Write a protein that binds this ligand. Sequence first.
Ligand SMILES: *[B]([O])([O])[C]([C][C]([C])[C])[N]C(=O)[C]([C]C1=[C][C]=[C][C]=[C]1)[N]C(=O)C1=[C]N=[C][C]=N1
Lengths: 245, 229
Amino acid sequence: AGFDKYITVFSPEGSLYQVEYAFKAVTYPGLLTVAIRCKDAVLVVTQHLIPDRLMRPDSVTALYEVTPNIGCCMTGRAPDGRALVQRAREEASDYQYRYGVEIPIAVLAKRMGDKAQVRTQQAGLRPMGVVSTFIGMDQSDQDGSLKPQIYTVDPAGWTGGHIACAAGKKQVEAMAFLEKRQKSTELDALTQKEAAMIALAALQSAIGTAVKAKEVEVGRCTAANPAFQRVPNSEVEEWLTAVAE
Amino acid sequence: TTILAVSYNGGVVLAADSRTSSGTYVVNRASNKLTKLTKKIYCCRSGSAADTQALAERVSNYLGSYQTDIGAGVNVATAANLFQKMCYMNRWNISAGIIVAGYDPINGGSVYSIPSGGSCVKLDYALGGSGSIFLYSFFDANYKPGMSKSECVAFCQRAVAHAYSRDGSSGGLIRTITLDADEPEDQTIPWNRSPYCMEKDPKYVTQATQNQPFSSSAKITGNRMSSTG
Ligand SMILES: *[B]([O])([O])[C]([C][C]([C])[C])[N]C(=O)[C]([C]C1=[C][C]=[C][C]=[C]1)[N]C(=O)C1=[C]N=[C][C]=N1
């Protein structure tokens, strides 16, 4: 009853205060990401803003490659996100050596949520103040096709699939735009051009700025080219004009 | 097993037979001794079928985990120092002759021959396997450096076909692949369309006159093919 909040100890209302304080390290940099999957692709947009003009803008990034078919964005404390990439690259490689096949995206999200649960149960270890968003396309069963996947793991360890997610500062106004857009159409029937307009407009409704094409970076995975790659900046400009239309 | 890798201007040409044989019996006549490490770097594979398969997929997982962390392409000299490290600290327990050949944009086409002793030598062409001892005097006479891509494919297919004609260990198909700045093109020509075989070699048509007829003279007149005459 002396501290109640300084190490991983249950509060008298049954909460962990080092979990609730690590959620606030996600919104503390002030950034934002939006992920969405269409019928045949996955998209991840994120705010890529450099305040200093003397900074090399192609070094600071949040989009990482875990395996050649899984990409991720790390929204939260930026050196903590680089730490969980190196953890996920070890787990995807040790899956490859031991089991011979590439790791499923739903399984790589589960094995990274088990790493976050241990750090919030042992008293000495600090939780990672970052929300991971592992995106990719899994091999479907009984037909052999590919299927878009989005998986998000909290700093507590809450893994789960998504149709469209958001993380960072004013992530509540980004969820509210996507649910309002969900009431009209059905997001698993839209195309890659149509779904790119929503994830960029959801990034506009929260920041209220209608940002430039260099102030974001977008990575994608498509059923034709299943490898994770980031888009060119010229293709973001073809999308930002359509949102203004 | 007869494996070889030859460099041209663009990239390299890997060439190998297809036969794993337990001493004297052909367990597999359609083996694949050309192992993919990365997209542009392969390795030829001779010796123990299990000891070299475990090395080839242990290097290929270090090499793909390296490529993701770097974010660029893997050099061939990088992949040839991961076989040398493993074939030297296991050299008393494995039987492994590896020829590593590939393509990188920095150095072009590279060929590394890693013998059973565990050394590493960078070459223009490499030979390996039990059938390679036939091909030293064949490359001393018939090989001229600086061929094109289409000439190195027809040469290495003609090179392997002279090797498994005399070797008992080697035989089967001829699996070749080229690794250069284009997409990797593979080609598997069979035995019955091989560029050389001793059965259709027109100087081995006449039987050696061993089974002489019972005659009155020392004049050798060929074999005895019938009971009457
Ligand atoms: B080649 O004949 O050397 C071949 C190379 C291998 C890496 C595909 N090796 C084998 O055929 C070996 C036998 C051998 C022959 C000559 C030298 C060294 C080894 N085959 C096997 O190891 C084997 C035997 N029985 C079952 C499975 N594998």
